[PDB]
Amino acid sequence: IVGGYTCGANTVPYQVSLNSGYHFCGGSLINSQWVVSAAHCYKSGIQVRLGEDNINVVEGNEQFISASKSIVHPSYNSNTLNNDIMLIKLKSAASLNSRVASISLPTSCASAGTQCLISGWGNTKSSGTSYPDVLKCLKAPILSDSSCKSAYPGQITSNMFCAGYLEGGKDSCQGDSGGPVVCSGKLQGIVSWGSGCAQKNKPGVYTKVCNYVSWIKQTIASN
Ligand SMILES: COC(=O)[C@H](Cc1cccc(C(=N)N)c1)[C@@H](C)NC(=O)c1ccc(-c2cccc(CN)c2)cc1
Ligand SMILES: [Ca+2]
Numbered sequence: 001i002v003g004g005y006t007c008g009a010n011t012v013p014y015q016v017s018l019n020s021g022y023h024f025c026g027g028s029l030i031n032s033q034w035v036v037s038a039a040h041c042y043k044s045g046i047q048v049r050l051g052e053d054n055i056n057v058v059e060g061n062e063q064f065i066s067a068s069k070s071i072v073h074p075s076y077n078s079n080t081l082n083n084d085i086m087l088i089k090l091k092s093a094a095s096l097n098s099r100v101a102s103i104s105l106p107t108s109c110a111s112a113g114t115q116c117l118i119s120g121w122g123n124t125k126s127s128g129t130s131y132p133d134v135l136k137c138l139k140a141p142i143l144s145d146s147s148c149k150s151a152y153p154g155q156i157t158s159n160m161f162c163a164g165y166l167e168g169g170k171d172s173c174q175g176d177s178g179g180p181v182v183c184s185g186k187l188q189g190i191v192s193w194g195s196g197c198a199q200k201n202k203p204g205v206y207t208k209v210c211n212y213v214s215w216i217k218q219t220i221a222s223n
Contacts, residue, residue, distance in 0.1 A: 001118065002126050002198040003170035004138035009053035010061060012119045012135060014103035014187075015180060017049040018088075019064075023131075026120045026179025028187055029102045032093040034220055035067075037178035038190050038207065039076040039086040046070060048090060051100045054133045055121055061099045066091040071219060073212075082157045084192045084207045086178075087219060105217075106186040109210035112144040116163060116183035118204075120191065122175025126168075126198040131175060138172065140164045142183070143203060151201055159211050161189065164203035172204050173197035181206050 016027035016035050025041035027048070035048055051061040068091040073083040094100055110116075118138045124130045140163045148162035156162070163181060164171050172179070172191045181189030189206035196202060 001120055001122060001136035001138045001176060002124055002173050004136040007119060007135045007137040009134070010051065010099040012117070012137065013099055013101040015052070015119050015135060017052050017055055017121060018178065019047045019049050020045050023055050023121050023175065025175070025177050026191065027088065028180040029094065029100070030105060030187065030216075031102050032096055033090045035088040035090065036187065036190065036209070036216070037086050037088060038084045038192055039072040040078065040081065040084055041178040042070055042072050042086055046088065048088065050094055053135055056133050063094055063100060065094060069223070071223070073215070080155070080157065081193055082159055085190060085209070085212055087216065089223060103180065103182060103187045104185060105213050106188055106210045109208065110142055110183045110188045112142050114142045114183045116140055116142060116181050116188065118163070118172050118176070118179070118181050118191065120172060120176030120179040122177070123173040123197065126171070126173070126196065138170060140170065140204070148203070148205070151203060152195070152205065156205065159208050160192070160205050161208050162203040162205055163189065166201050166203060168198050168200035171198035
């Protein structure tokens with residue numbers, strides 16, 4: 001997160017860290033055994049880390065659970081990043097409590113202007129690299145589809161939306177990928193891509209989760 005603030009320990013209880021000996025992507029807990037992340041975060045050997053704040057120190061409240069399977073959307077395209085969503089089933093159910101909790105899926109898509117909270121342990125610099133120890137947060141509005149398509153001509157599909165600030169200085173960034181965009185208590189987006197980070201007229205692009213709610217439900221029901 002570039003230009004954000006320290007969230008405060010366990011104030012985002014649905015945030016997940018995906019770990020393979022180091023943090024590489026975020027995710028969102030949507031019930032006690034399933035996590036939603038981005039398809040381009042896929043790799044084998046994923047350990048899901050719940051209840052995290054400082055990812056480098058064991059502070060208490062962490063739960064480390066192996067992924068038993070990761071389901072990349074069958075139509076994900078790595079060249080366009082269309083359908084950039086993945087489900088991860090945990091080997092064991094998480095213990096839900098005040099510090100580890102799930103986030104609700106949307107019942108409808110959010111409008112332009114809706115304020116959202118984005119969080120993660122990604123890069124805090126738009127120029128070099130600086131990774132935080134603790135979770136960073138950012139409030140950002142959903143932009144209109146015409147401004148989004150003007151910023152990225154030919155690259156925005158109907159499964160994507162832009163959120164952020166066209167003046168630059170505040171954005172998500174590498175390492176935040178797969179993590180949550182929560183608007184009004186509902187998971188509306190997944191951190192997916194952007195051109196650089198926090199650059200002027202190049203906002204963040206996010207997977208539009210409301211287009212995938214019946215796919216998520218049908219897939220979890222059969223697995
Ligand atoms: C430093 O810069 C970064 O980290 C970002 C990635 C990234 C990751 C997470 C969030 C954000 C963001 N800005 N919100 C950005 C870097 C590594 N990536 C890019 O430049 C980048 C990523 C995708 C495309 C791209 C997307 C769709 C189609 C095509 C045509 N084939 C290209 C173009 C540039
Ligand atoms: Ca920790």
